[PDB]
Amino acid sequence: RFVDDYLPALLAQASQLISSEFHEVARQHGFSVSEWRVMASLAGSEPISIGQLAQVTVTKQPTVTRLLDRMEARGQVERLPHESDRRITLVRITRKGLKAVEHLMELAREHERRVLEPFGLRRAEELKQTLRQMIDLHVH
Amino acid sequence: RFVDDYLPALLAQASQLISSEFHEVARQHGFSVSEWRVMASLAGSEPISIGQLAQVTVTKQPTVTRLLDRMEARGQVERLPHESDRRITLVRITRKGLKAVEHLMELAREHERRVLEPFGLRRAEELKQTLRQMIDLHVH
Ligand SMILES: O=C(O)CCc1c[nH]c2ccccc12
Ligand SMILES: O=C(O)CCc1c[nH]c2ccccc12
């Protein structure tokens, strides 16, 4: 059957199944999916643009802006002007947001280790390498 | 940074970027994303359950049921009773739906070939193999 080997379908199914496993943990720790994606994407990062955040969190930019309105109100993130461009807003995690998400990030790493363990280090690194190359070739 | 190598984030970004490329083609041919996923998942398939269709199309089951209401009204799919279980509904593509989607499926195969060409046959097959194994290990 067409769908059994069609790459976009395989990527989307694998992504949904693994992510839905971790979302149960995230919600048990008081996070929504979008809050978790934003804080995990910003943790240990320099400030990035709203558009970059939208791409890496796979969230539409108007949705991200509304999310940042409330996460900034809760002191978990901060928006800042671009040092040069008046049309670009940067965003960073605050210390409060980092402390809020650090434990969950450790649980995320453990869950990822469990997902990748049956494949071995070689196949795991090959998968991550291929995905990174694909993203860098298709990002706008 | 955590997010740069986190497998669920890599899978979701790669999936979104590649799929969004093909969705432009699908809509130019008059398909919505959900209609394309249903018809492509059913093409060349025996009847499958609603729950199976929801999993492979990564669409919530109530959403799939509403979608099938209108696709069945347009004669593109047919729901049928399970030969044994009264609690299971099966669904299939009709000849009309297959003829509607066949050309688009060829374009999908060409787009996939372009996406995978830089990686080579070995890395492409390794990726598809790993994704299939991951789905089969995490599907409920
Ligand atoms: O490209 C998409 O629309 C998402 C990938 C995808 C998930 N399930 C699918 C079933 C058939 C064709 C494509 C898909
Ligand atoms: O697990 C998810 O919520 C989807 C995967 C995902 C996409 N972008 C992300 C950014 C940070 C952490 C996880 C993700």
Numbering used by the authors:
A (entry chain A), B (entry chain A): 10 to 149
Could you give the paper's own sentences about this structure?
When a relevant ligand binds the MarR repressor, it releases from DNA, allowing gene expression.
Eleven additional auxin and aromatic ligands were examined, with ten exhibiting lower affinities for MarR_73 than that of IAA. MarR_73 structures complexed with nine other auxins were also determined and refined to 1.35–1.6 Å resolution. The MarR_73 structures resolved in complexes with other auxins revealed that the positions of ligand-contacting regions remained unchanged upon the binding of auxins, with the exceptions of the His-32 imidazole ring, which shifted by up to 2.9 Å, and the Arg-46 guanidinium group, which shifted by up to 4.2 Å. In both cases, these shifts accommodated differences in the carboxylate-containing substituent groups of the auxins examined.
